[PDB]
Ligand binder design. Structure first.
Ligand SMILES: Nc1ncnc2c1ncn2[C@@H]1O[C@H](COP(=O)(O)OP(=O)(O)O)[C@@H](O)[C@H]1O
Ligand SMILES: Nc1ncnc2c1ncn2[C@@H]1O[C@H](COP(=O)(O)OP(=O)(O)O)[C@@H](O)[C@H]1O
Ligand SMILES: Nc1ncnc2c1ncn2[C@@H]1O[C@H](COP(=O)(O)OP(=O)(O)O)[C@@H](O)[C@H]1O
Ligand SMILES: [K+]
Ligand SMILES: [K+]
Ligand SMILES: [K+]
Ligand SMILES: [Mg+2]
Ligand SMILES: [Mg+2]
Ligand SMILES: [Mg+2]
Lengths: 329, 329, 329
């Protein structure tokens, strides 16, 4: 029948999402998984392990199953989707739609399918994240109109020119959210001589981070370890200095856009001026990222609604398409 | 019986038309056909492929089945008329009237017949496009009065002196719509340093193109790729500069008219002054093309109604003639 | 019986006429016959081919069956009278009266009879055109009174002194209508540097041609090919310059009249002063040709009524005479 079960997965570097047809997104948690480093046993995953990063003894190993679409830890990758498939095992012929970044090789994608199949998958389908992100952002990719999708995730900023449902031009760079957190951590050590964890650096980016000055920007207090005294030390950080370090981090992302537009066919480039840039992903939540991209490229920039879910929302829309590609052909 | 099915085809370089007796023109779409360059499979044809030219990855091959009446792609030519014959297969002894330009050799015309026969044609008839265009423009070619037919198509400008239903003098040159689009593209690159696709160049010719200044000519905005910055760039183009580049493109067409009239018998040349020039085809829609031809040759110039359909409308009229040539003789 | 069918023919260089007893002139059309030069097949004859002269491709051969009474084309001559005999075949013992110019040899006249007999003629009679033209002009040739008949046809100007029903003195020259058309064509090329066809040159002679200035002579517009530019060119031509070129063309006809009167017996020459000159044929329609001949020879000149039909009208009158020569003798 056509009521066949359907599951799609966003195996992101920072957040893992799982959509089930008829039940919505049943799983949406960070990718961190805590393991007992003495017994190689699973301790926690999702939020329970994400609240412990930087707060664990050496006997607790923090693991990310997938980094930039590639299986970073085989034991963790299959432990993750076993937890997801078990909540589907307890409700038999589900369709497994995987979304893979453009940088994943075919050899690594066959590994993603087998790991899914090894844990109990019958039919595994792989689609490009860019067209999934474009579907979740509201673009009708079937139309012959060029669109520019910028997906700023946890460890990869993915760029793609999409027209007629295909990736005309594609670029990728390993500079994203995790790189922004490290630069914030390294800046606060060079400017205030205070060591902070990755979690504090990430919360600063979310609370006061921006690329253009916004209305009534506030300053927040950090709490870390003093390099000089060794004792815990406090510090006040303004939104401006967080903006200047994000400005510097976006330097390698901006030139990639120049390189993507350099090799874009002239008829597509015409559509980019009228259709514009669509920024999606976690990095799309940077304050005034639309005005920042507009001020540089003179291109109209819009932020997709629920940018975190553009990939998993696109797989929602693409379920009726793969069922056509399965029932037919 | 005399109610035998009848189909005629305009296999033009830019537009393909198909007339069925009793149903009118059932097919009228551009010639572009999109093929999967990895599997050599047909993806789209007509408008679906025409909206994608300049907007496709390298894995999509854009194909024109016939260029200037000659089979440019064997696989595409038979894929095209199979799509047309199928819509006739689903409604058995149809007459296939083909209209061929004057530049097609008899060896290439036998290929056009066999390809039609190979896909299921029983009786294939070939007629000259010039007399078909003259029939579709309102000329009674049976009368002993000379007429000058200028057919400006996609890739060929065809000239013919017609009298008593025969081609007295004939000339042809491979300078037409596609040459005009390229010159517009090359002018906008040399004047504004902006690369545009073929589709934008064609729309400029249709929206503001002309050969003589017309009432309240407007300027339009193009959108392409900047040669210098590599980013998409906008430009404003007036109707005057588009007129001057069309003026230069029509230089090789004007001297061909001089050459056609140079070798025209003196009694025919007398009729050309009184009957005049009949401009038909897509290029006949150039604004003030009648006044432009009149200012050069001092010959009265008239634009045929529905110049795009002069060939397919002429085959409509010539159905009762070929039935006479079939039932008799 | 005496109700035997009777057909007479005027196989002129310019016009072919056919009279049937009891039905009048059933055929009266120009001599031009159009043939497919690739298949030697008959395409058209009469007016249909006359409207195409100078307006045909090289694959269409224009043929005149008889030039100056001699079979110019054997295939065309028998194709012509087969078309005439067929309209008599569909209504069985007809009398075939042929009128032959004085320049036709007996060997060529036997060819005219056999070609008629080869297509289905039983009894073929040949008579002199001059006495037939004299009968059609109203002269009672049986009377012993001398008359001067000037027959200006398409390619021959025939002169004869007729008395008692016999040709006393006869002269002929190959200068007539076709020579006048060529001189008009050659004059318009030398005076205006414009090439015109034979049809335009003939219509000028008919519309404004004359030998003496007439009342309210007009100027007409020609349309031909310019020698310099190669483009069609217009020109205005007055009746005076057309008169001066006809005056020069009639130079060789005038001296022939002097030569005919030089060898005319003195008793006949006396009758020429009182009876006068009778001008018949197409050339008799030249405006003021009677006053022109009168001003030169001081001889009274009269134009025969329906000068084009003087030969075929004379054969009408000579039917009762040949029936006497057949029933008796
Ligand atoms: N409000 C916010 N402001 C700035 N950055 C954010 C915000 N929310 C999330 N992020 C960043 O976005 C990243 C997660 O986005 P996502 O596209 O789900 O990553 P991935 O697809 O790689 O798993 C996190 O690393 C986080 O640092
Ligand atoms: N309004 C217009 N103004 C100028 N050019 C036009 C217009 N409409 C069509 N054309 C040109 O005419 C061409 C198509 O005319 P057509 O005679 O159908 O070509 P073909 O017969 O070779 O297929 C196209 O290439 C297009 O560029
Ligand atoms: N109105 C006219 N004025 C001057 N010439 C004429 C006129 N009508 C006919 N003709 C000439 O007379 C010729 C035909 O006369 P006709 O005696 O029938 O010729 P033929 O007897 O040789 O066939 C034509 O060649 C034409 O040029
Ligand atoms: K994610
Ligand atoms: K066409
Ligand atoms: K005649
Ligand atoms: Mg992502
Ligand atoms: Mg055409
Ligand atoms: Mg005659």
């Amino acid at each position: 029948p056509e009521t066949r079960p359907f599951i799609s997965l966003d195996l992101g570097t920072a957040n893992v999402l799982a959509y089930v047809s008829g039940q919505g997104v049943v799983y949406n948690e960070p990718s961190l998984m805590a393991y007992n480093n003495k017994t190689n046993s699973l301790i926690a995953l999702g939020k329970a392990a994400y609240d412990m990063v930087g707060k664990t003894h050496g006997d607790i190993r923090m693991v990310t199953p997938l980094v930039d679409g590639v299986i970073a830890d085989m034991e963790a990758a299959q432990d993750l989707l076993k937890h997801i498939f078990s909540r589907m095992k307890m409700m038999k012929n589900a369709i497994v739609l995987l979304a893979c970044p453009s940088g994943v090789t075919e050899l690594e994608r066959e590994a993603l399918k087998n790991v899914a199949k090894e844990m109990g998958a019958e039919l595994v389908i792989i689609e490009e994240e860019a067209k999934m992100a474009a579907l979740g952002a509201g673009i009708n990719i079937e139309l012959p109109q060029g669109h520019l999708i910028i997906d700023i995730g946890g460890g990869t900023t993915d760029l793609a020119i999409i027209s007629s449902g295909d990736i005309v031009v594609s670029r990728s760079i390993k500079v994203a959210g995790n790189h922004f957190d490290d630069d914030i951590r390294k800046y606060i050590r060079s400017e205030y001589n205070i060591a902070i964890g990755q979690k504090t650096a990430e919360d600063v980016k979310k609370f006061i981070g921006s690329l253009v000055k916004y209305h009534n920007e506030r300053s927040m207090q950090i709490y870390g370890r003093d390099i000089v005294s060794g004792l815990p030390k406090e510090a006040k950080i303004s939104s401006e200095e967080i903006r200047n370090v994000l400005l510097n981090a976006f330097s390698k992302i901006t030139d990639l856009v120049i390189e993507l537009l350099e090799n874009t066919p002239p008829e597509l480039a015409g559509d980019i001026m009228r259709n514009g840039i669509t920024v999606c992903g976690g990095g799309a939540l940077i304050r005034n990222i639309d005005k920042y991209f507009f001020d540089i490229f003179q291109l109209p920039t819009k932020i997709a609604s629920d940018s975190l879910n553009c990939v998993i929302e696109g797989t929602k829309i693409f379920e009726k398409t793969i069922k056509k590609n399965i029932e037919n052909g």
